RNA sequence: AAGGUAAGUAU
């Protein structure tokens, strides 16, 4: 089942663990994705 | 045997070859001469 | 002197009961959970 | 006289502690007159176990030792060995140490 | 930031309380189940 | 406590120790009402049948039978003592008192192990047996 | 203060 579900794209990337990122690397990638969003650390117009 | 009165004039320590023991001096009544 | 007297008034009962039950003719000598059953 | 009563009480406490020491007819523990308990010889391990006293006995021994120290200081003053000021300083040292 | 390649944020890491409690309980069950057990086995479990 | 056989005088204890020639006599000195004694007696009752082949368990009330209080120092709330062929057997429990077990044991397996070790050592002729568990610490963590 | 008693035959 897992071999077939990895052959096909049954599980989208947001399902963890994904066999490619250890949980510490998952945290690192999550923090990098947070920091890489468009103007994420901006509060000039009250966005939060 | 069970349910049998003790014979008169019998010391429970004697007749069996029992020997006491003292772990310390703070336990038990003082030895009487 | 008074400090050690104040200690003495408190420690006297302990020594008295330890002695009187020691040089007397007759000597005297996990249960919460294994209680109600 | 208070010094006489102190000497009497020191002697009586020594007698009582001596009676407690030779409780089980064991004569390999000796109590001196300064109330120090020491074996009379190199006692064997079984005899060392057989001659054990609880914290209460040693507490009584040490309090009688303190009384002996006080009474001996007063006796030394009464004989003439030490001055009254020396006696007061000695009592202060006894109760501070 | 992967686009500007500049310092933008700062991530502070810390061990969660649950992880610390889990480690403490693991050490406790190592210790308490060590009555008739060799020293080498206890040290191996602690090291692991 | 109320299931194990009871010895009512010093002579009965003497005969109980003397009677058994191939089994270790396990005697609990204490009181039925003592909570420590109730725990010890319920453990003994739990293992009473399993050790039938190599052990016999009796209960002695020290208030009713103060005959052995002086010699055996039966002044703790509970006491368990082992005899073999009319000979008191000591156990290196690690508690400093090898002559008796003077506390209540929870696990029923540990008492079986102690009785088994006592039986082995006594049948080998020993007067002291080293217990499989060291009781210098309650292993509480 | 302890948790540091080898046990066993023999008088």
Domain map (residue ranges) of chain F:
2-136
Distance CA F78, CA F32 (A): 10
Q: Which residue of C has its CA nearest to B30?
A: C23
Tokens 């077990």 identify what position?
A: F101
- Give, in Å, how far the C1' of G7 lies from the CA of F99: 13
F70–B20 C-beta distance less than 8 A:
yes
Q: Within window 105-134 on F, which residues have Cβ closer than 7 Å to strand G? A: 125-128
F95: nearest nucleotide, CA–C1' criterion: G3
One DSSP character per residue, F76-98 reads SSEEEEEESSS-EEEEE-SSS-T
Longest dimension (CA), chain E: 62
Q: Do chains B and C touch (3 or more CB pairs under 8 A)?
A: yes
The tokens for D8 are 């009497």
Tokens 């390999």 identify what position?
A: D28
B26–C27 C-beta distance less than 8 A:
no
Q: Note the resolution in Å, 1 decimal.
A: 3.1
Other beta carbons less than 10 A from residue D33's beta carbon: 10
**Which residue's C-alpha is at the least distance from the C1' of G7?**
F127
Other beta carbons less than 10 A from residue E46's beta carbon: 12
E9–A35 C-beta distance less than 8 A:
yes
| CA distances, F16 to each of E45, F38, F41, F79 (Å) | 48, 22, 18, 17
Percent helix / strand / coil, chain C, rounded to 5: 50, 0, 50
**Chain G nucleotides near the protein (CB, 7 A):** 1-9
Give residue E28's Cα distance to chain centre: 13
Instruction: Decide: helix, strand or coil at residue D95.
Output: helix
Distance CA D47, CA D77 (A): 42
Q: What angle do CA F51, F19, F119 make, to 5 degrees?
A: 35
Distance CA B16, CA B18 (A): 6
User: Cβ(F102)–Cβ(F78) under 8 Å?
Assistant: yes
Q: With a 7 Å cutoff on the CB, does F140 touch strand G?
A: no
User: Cβ(D61)–Cβ(D37) under 8 Å?
Assistant: yes
Residue F111 exposed, middle or buried by CB count within 10 Å (0-12, 13-18, 19+) = buried
Q: Do chains A and E touch (3 or more CB pairs under 8 A)?
A: yes
Distance CA F57, CA F41 (A): 10
Best C17, C22, C24, C28 residue to mutate vs chain B (most B CBs within 10 Å) = C22
CATH code of the domain occupying F2-136: 3.40.30.10
Tokens 């309650």 identify what position?
A: F138
Strands F78-83 and F88-92: antiparallel
What are φ and ψ of residue B24, in 5° steps?
-155, 180
| CA distances, A45 to each of A29, A41, C21, F3 (Å) | 28, 12, 85, 83
Distance CA F105, CA F36 (A): 9
The tokens for C4 are 């050690």
Strands D29-31 and F6-7: unpaired
Strands F24-30 and F78-83: antiparallel
Q: What angle do CA F99, F101, F107 make, to 5 degrees?
A: 150
D24–B26 C-beta distance less than 8 A:
no
Q: With a 7 Å cutoff on the CB, does F99 touch strand G?
A: yes
Strands F55-61 and F78-83: unpaired
The tokens for F79 are 């006491």
By what method was this entry solved? Answer: cryo-EM
């Amino acid at each position: 089942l897992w071999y077939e579900a990895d052959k096909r794209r049954l599980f989208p990337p947001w399902i963890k663990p994904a066999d490619t990122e250890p949980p510490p690397l998952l945290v690192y990638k999550w923090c990098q994705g947070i920091n890489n969003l468009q103007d994420v650390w901006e509060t000039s117009e009250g966005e939060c | 045997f069970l349910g049998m009165p003790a014979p008169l004039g019998y010391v429970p320590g004697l007749g069996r070859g029992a020997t006491g023991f003292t772990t310390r001096s703070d336990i038990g009544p003082a030895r009487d001469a | 002197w008074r400090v050690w007297l104040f200690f003495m008034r408190g420690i006297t009962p302990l020594l008295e009961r330890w002695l009187g039950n020691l040089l007397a003719r007759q000597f005297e000598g996990q249960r919460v959970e294994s209680h109600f059953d | 006289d208070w010094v006489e009563v102190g000497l009497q009480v020191c002697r009586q406490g020594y007698n009582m502690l001596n009676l407690l020491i030779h409780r089980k007819n064991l004569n390999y523990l000796h109590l001196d007159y300064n109330f120090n308990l020491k074996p009379v010889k190199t006692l064997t391990t079984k005899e060392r176990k057989k001659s054990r006293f609880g914290n209460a006995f040693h507490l009584c021994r040490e309090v009688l030792r303190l009384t002996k120290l006080v009474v001996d200081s007063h006796v030394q003053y009464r004989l003439g060995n030490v001055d009254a000021f020396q006696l007061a300083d000695g009592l202060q040292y006894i109760f501070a140490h | 930031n992967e686009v500007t390649k500049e310092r933008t944020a700062q991530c502070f890491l810390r061990v969660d309380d649950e992880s610390m409690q889990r480690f403490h309980n693991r050490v406790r069950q190592i210790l308490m189940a060590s009555g008739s057990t060799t020293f080498t086995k206890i040290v191996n479990k602690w090291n692991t | 406590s109320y299931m194990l056989p009871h010895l009512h005088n010093g002579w009965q204890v003497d005969q109980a120790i003397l009677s058994e020639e191939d089994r270790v006599v396990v005697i609990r000195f204490g009181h039925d009402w003592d909570p420590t004694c109730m725990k010890m007696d319920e453990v003994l009752y739990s293992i009473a049948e399993k050790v039938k082949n190599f052990a016999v368990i009796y209960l002695v009330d020290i208030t009713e039978v103060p005959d052995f209080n002086k010699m055996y120092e039966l002044y703790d709330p509970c006491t368990v003592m082992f005899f073999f062929r009319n000979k008191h057997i000591m156990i290196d429990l690690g508690t400093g008192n090898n002559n008796k077990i003077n506390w209540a044991m929870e696990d029923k397996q540990e008492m079986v192990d102690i009785i088994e070790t006592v039986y082995r050592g006594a049948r080998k002729g020993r007067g002291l047996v080293v217990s499989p568990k060291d009781y210098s610490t309650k292993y509480r963590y």
